[PDB]
């Protein structure tokens, strides 16, 4: 029922650096066109958290909006001998890559975007762990998102926030405490969040809340060309000026001038938009990003 999932907050840029050959439909993502780094996120049921918060930013959008920094290095070469510095983080993730991707990206332990990358004419294997030369379809021009997540800006300092999980010895690459006894091992889907000045915080339970507002990213605006994405910053506030004429719903017209039959664009409140906060060791905090990933977890017996 939501027709505006492609009208993106931020840059709406769903490409990874070094793969710019689909910039026409990924830079920015908009109503028209296909974008191999973004469209998979909208496949019903594949990315349920993002699809519940689809007017918030993707990982690539948050990277290009300068909310999340890129890891150093920003891509790992899977063909190499020693492998790549990402290998430890990647191997503890259980992932399924569709065919025909050359690249895949994830939010690493430092809260930065890392990626695994194949050479020219090489594709990722199905487990996302190796590269291979298959004689088949052309490769996609973008990068596959490895985690189900969404992002937003935040100034809330998380420098004192740390993973705390009852009875866990290891989760992904995080060893939580000494355990010299016998352990049980499983792949688990674990929620996590990243905060300003924090590392990745894995969590035992996901408890989220959303505060709606009338900030610019709480709206999606479109004009008629075919639909076209429109920059809300052009719309005059009540009592102010702009470069375009706009109109919209009651929430929009509470803050912006609405010119009805002369407007160049229509703006409406984005389902689910607002500040999402997350509960972490009993306290509500404003994260940079929230997501799920599937990682090895070892627990005390």
């Amino acid at each position, epitope marked *: 029922e939501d027709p505006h999932l492609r009208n993106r907050p931020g840059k709406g840029h769903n490409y990874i650096d070094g793969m710019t050959q689909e*910039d*026409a439909t990924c830079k920015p993502v908009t109503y028209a066109g296909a974008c191999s780094s973004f469209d998979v996120l909208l496949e019903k049921g594949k990315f349920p958290l993002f699809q519940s918060y689809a007017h918030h930013r993707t990982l690539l959008e948050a990277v290009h909006d300068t909310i999340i920094a890129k890891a150093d290095p920003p891509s790992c070469d899977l063909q190499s001998a020693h492998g790549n510095p990402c290998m430890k983080e990647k191997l503890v993730m259980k992932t399924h890559c569709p065919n025909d991707y050359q690249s895949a990206h994830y939010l690493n332990n430092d809260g930065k975007m890392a990626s695994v990358k194949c*050479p020219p004419k090489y594709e990722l294997t199905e487990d996302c762990n190796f590269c291979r030369q298959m004689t088949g379809a*052309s490769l996609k021009k973008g990068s596959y998102p490895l985690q189900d997540l969404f992002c937003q800006s935040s100034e809330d300092d998380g420098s004192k926030l740390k993973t705390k999980m009852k009875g866990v010895c290891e989760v992904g690459v995080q060893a939580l405490k000494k355990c010299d006894g016998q352990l049980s091992t499983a792949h688990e889907v674990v929620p996590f969040a990243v905060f300003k000045n924090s590392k990745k915080v894995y969590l035992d339970k996901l408890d989220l809340k959303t505060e709606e507002n009338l900030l610019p990213d709480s709206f999606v605006c479109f004009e008629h060309k075919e639909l076209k994405s429109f920059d809300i910053s052009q719309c005059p506030k009540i009592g102010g000026h702009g470069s375009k004429k706009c109109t919209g719903d009651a929430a929009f017209c509470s803050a912006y001038e609405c010119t009805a039959q002369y407007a160049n664009a229509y703006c409406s409140h984005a389902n689910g938009s607002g500040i999402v906060q997350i509960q972490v060791s009993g306290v509500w905090k404003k994260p940079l990003c929230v997501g799920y990933e599937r990682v090895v977890v070892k627990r005390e017996l």
Partner: antibody
Amino acid sequence: QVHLVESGGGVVQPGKSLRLSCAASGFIFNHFGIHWVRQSPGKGLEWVAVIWYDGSKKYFADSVKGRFSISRDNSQNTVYLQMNSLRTEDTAVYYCARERWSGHSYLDYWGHGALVTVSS
Amino acid sequence: SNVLTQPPSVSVAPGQTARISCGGNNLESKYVHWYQQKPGQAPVLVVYEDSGRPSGIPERFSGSNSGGTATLTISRVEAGDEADYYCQEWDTSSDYPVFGGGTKVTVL
């Protein structure tokens, strides 16, 4: 059905200017870059210019670096190639051509060809 | 810089396959394409992304890039294929592509 119709190709003298026009139909003007590749009389192909899908990147050939400019209009689905200070060797059949991917890609659709004769 | 080298001219009898080469550095890595220009006409793309068949190209035409050399093979050569054939690479490091000199193929 993609069609690339070019015009503005005429007979001009050296030192003066011309403006090549490439109208495009059968696709989305916003999703594809447009190149200009000239072929001299009976010689080989030569890429001359490219304007990006959005016009943020505009690259020129070094033989016309500075003397040539490019622009595009979405309201008209048109690409203009302005050629100031034309030289005799610029005499060629110029083809505007769509590029499939935004950069480092192949040219999938070509135009009929505008003859620019730069004789004195 | 990056330069593409083709044979100046190749001739072949009808029906028999003909092969056109394109040389240069790191052709294994790079993507090589091929255009077919018949005289007095616009160049028509016939090979894209090494092996790659555009819509409207018969099985008689095929592209490849191996060992460091690109190749275009034409089986059951019809006389209506007498034309110029240009290979082209656009490396990621290059802000604009490179066309080969151009093979000039005549039917016998």
